[PDB]
């Protein structure tokens, strides 16, 4: 029912582990250079729809050849490839669609464009983060935002160290999945198995979990599937040390796991003056924050709210899936009074989800700064406020098991690590807003 498009090398279609599961499409667009030609692809197809080793054991697949025999392709090849899918999606429209790109090139304006245009058509795009031990945001389709970018983890859920390099990281990596010494279908023979590494393996794993999810609920959105892929991922398993101090905060400490089958929120970081951090088209912005390595506003943009931050600063958006919600942002300019700058969700049934300061149900900021409030109405939405103070570097306040963090803040940068609100400096009171069903 769930078709998983695979754009890779050729595949050993016969392979008894993925036999009749995979269909080989008449698409080939590979740059000039025999079993080794099927090698990478077959193993991934095995990882996804394998009879013995597969994640989504039953899943139907379709393969397009975009990589040659040394696994080298072209941006154009891939582009035309994705176009083939879009064209096929218009001919005999298939059910839930998952597109697997277990590849990496440099940053491509056109490919990320191709990916977004295709993703907006409600297609679940799963891609490898890259095996270069670098910020994924410099690679494509890795850098792409609507694409689920996947980093690879070893047997101890730590990041894969591939030769002198290893797994890519950064704010572009959506989550991490096992990608070291993976046993899957080997092209050596119709019944052979082999252990391969890399972010492709990681992507393919997630591509499987995604396929699994849509088998159960075909109507799921990309934004819904992402939020759930995040929610049910194993948290804080990775020793952040393996990454540069610079990239640690930005890198999600998630390790992919099967979601069994409610409010979901996610932290969205921006690139380093004005910085913008945006939510998915069906996601609501419930909070906005910012951060500097040294020392924010919620504005509207095309009928959709965005987190805007003013060396450079990161706009930190909190994107949530809040069914049937009437949200608005009310802003009160500096009062210059000793009490402070205040603003409240003056309406009834309209709860405060988050605050935003730049220079009960009420935001209190410094006298000289303008204060923004996120006021949302949703069917039965409770919103607690938890505070924590200590007499420092980082203080942390966290929502109780049943509450989703909608808004992290520092009492007069600061950000939300899963359901934990963090405040950073050199009494320090941290403020978290917790919302419910």
């Amino acid at each position: 029912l769930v078709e998983v498009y695979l754009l890779d090398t050729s595949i050993q279609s016969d392979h008894r582990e993925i036999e009749g599961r995979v269909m080989v499409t008449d698409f080939e667009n590979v740059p000039e250079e025999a079993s080794k030609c099927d090698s990478h692809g077959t193993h991934l197809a095995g990882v996804v729809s394998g009879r013995d080793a597969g994640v989504a054991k039953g899943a139907s697949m379709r393969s397009l050849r975009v990589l040659n025999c040394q696994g080298k392709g072209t941006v154009s090849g891939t582009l035309i490839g994705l176009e083939f899918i879009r064209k096929s999606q218009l001919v005999q429209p298939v059910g839930p669609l998952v597109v697997l790109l277990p590849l990496a090139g440099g940053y491509s304006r056109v490919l990320n464009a191709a990916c977004q245009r295709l993703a907006r058509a409600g297609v679940v795009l799963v891609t490898a983060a890259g095996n270069f031990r670098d910020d994924a945001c410099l690679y494509s389709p890795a850098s792409a935002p609507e694409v689920i970018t996947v980093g690879a983890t070893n047997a101890q859920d730590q990041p894969v160290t591939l030769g002198t390099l290893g797994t890519n990281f950064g704010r572009c990596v959506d989550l991490f999945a096992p990608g070291e010494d993976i046993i899957g279908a080997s092209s050596d023979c119709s019944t052979c198995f082999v252990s391969q590494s890399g972010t492709s393996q990681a992507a393919a794993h997630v591509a499987g979990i995604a396929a699994m999810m849509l088998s159960a609920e075909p109507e799921l959105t990309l934004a819904e599937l992402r939020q759930r892929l995040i929610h049910f991922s194993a948290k804080d398993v990775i020793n952040e040390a393996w990454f540069p101090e610079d990239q640690r905060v930005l890198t999600p400490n998630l390790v992919a796991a099967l979601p069994p089958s409610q409010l979901f929120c996610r932290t969205v970081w921006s690139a380093h003056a004005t910085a913008i951090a945006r939510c998915a088209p069906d996601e609501e912005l419930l909070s906005c924050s910012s951060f500097s390595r040294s020392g924010e506003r919620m504005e509207a943009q095309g009928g959709k709210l965005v987190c805007r931050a003013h060396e450079g600063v990161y706009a930190i958006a909190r994107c949530c899936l809040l069914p049937q919600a009437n949200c608005s942002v009310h802003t009160a300019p500096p009062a210059e009074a000793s009490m402070g700058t205040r603003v409240h969700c003056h309406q009834q049934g309209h709860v405060l989800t988050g605050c935003s300061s730049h220079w009960p149900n009420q935001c209190v900021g410094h006298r000289e700064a303008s204060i923004h409030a996120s006021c949302c109405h949703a069917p039965g939405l409770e919103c607690k406020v938890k505070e924590h103070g200590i007499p420092q570097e980082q203080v942390t306040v966290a929502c109780e098991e049943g509450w989703t963090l909608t808004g992290c803040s520092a009492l007069p940068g600061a950000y939300a690590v899963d359901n934990t609100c963090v405040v950073r400096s050199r009494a320090v009171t941290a403020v978290a807003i917790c919302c419910r069903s």
Epitope: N154, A155, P178, E180, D181, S190, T191, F193, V194, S195
Partner: antibody, heavy 121, light 107 residues
Framework: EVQLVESGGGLVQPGGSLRLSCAAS????????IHWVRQAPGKGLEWVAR????????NYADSVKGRFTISADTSKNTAYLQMNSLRAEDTAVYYC??????????????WGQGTLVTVSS | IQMTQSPSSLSASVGDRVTITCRAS??????VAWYQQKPGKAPKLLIY???FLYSGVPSRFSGSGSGTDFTLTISSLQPEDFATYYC?????????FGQGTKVEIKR
């Protein structure tokens, strides 16, 4: 210097639970697949379940489905078999064996000594 | 999943060419293996991938196999060869063993 040390086995009552251990030494643990093959006294060999330590990927025998569960501790280099809802028929010598590393997945090159599981009231 | 060994017991003397038949539950390609277990001991691998002779296993040992029908051949039988032999269906998902063949000494 490649060995699969088998421990945890013994006597347990019907309906009871039992945990077993497979201590892997002298080879890259995560890299391979580890199986459990039981054998009732007068009877032959029966594969019960497998695991691929890095992936965590498993497959079981329909005979043992839902009752037994394979886990692996990559840090401690040990494979475990959690045998809940035990029957009387489950009486067997439990072997753990490693995959040859190539070709067909069920090819067991090295086998453990075996741990005895006796289950009766 | 039924994998059948023929015979269940064969008796022969040192030097004889011993043969053991094996029928897989379906076309299993060359996804077959042969194991030798001595009473009170753990089984020992002999042949894999239907014809591949595992390291250190004496050259006496041969493996033949179409897709359904397979055959272990112990050319020039030996005293230490007198043991119980298992067939293995190392095919994806459907994994089984044969009933076992006891290589007996004729007196």
């Amino acid at each position: 210097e490649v060995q699969l040390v088998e421990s945890g086995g013994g006597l347990v009552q019907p309906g009871g639970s039992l945990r077993l251990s497979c201590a892997a030494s002298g080879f890259t643990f995560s890299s391979t697949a580890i199986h459990w093959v039981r054998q009732a006294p007068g009877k032959g060999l029966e594969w019960v379940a497998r695991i691929s330590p890095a992936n965590g990927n498993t497959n079981y025998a329909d005979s043992v489905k839902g009752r037994f569960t394979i886990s692996a501790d990559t840090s401690k280099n040990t494979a475990y078999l959690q045998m809940n809802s035990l029957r009387a028929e489950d009486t067997a010598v439990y072997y753990c064996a490693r995959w040859i590393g190539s070709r067909e997945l069920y090819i067991m090159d090295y086998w453990g000594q075996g741990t005895l599981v006796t289950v009766s009231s | 999943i039924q994998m059948t060994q023929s015979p269940s017991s064969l008796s022969a003397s040192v030097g004889d060419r011993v043969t053991i038949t094996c029928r897989a539950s379906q076309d299993v390609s060359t996804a077959v293996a042969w194991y030798q277990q001595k009473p009170g001991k753990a089984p020992k691998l002999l042949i894999y991938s239907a014809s591949f002779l595992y390291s250190g296993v004496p050259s006496r040992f041969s493996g033949s196999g179409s897709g359904t029908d397979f055959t272990l051949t112990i050319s020039s039988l030996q005293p230490e060869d007198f043991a119980t032999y298992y067939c293995q269906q190392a095919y994806p998902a459907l994994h089984t063993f044969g009933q076992g063949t006891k290589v007996e000494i004729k007196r």
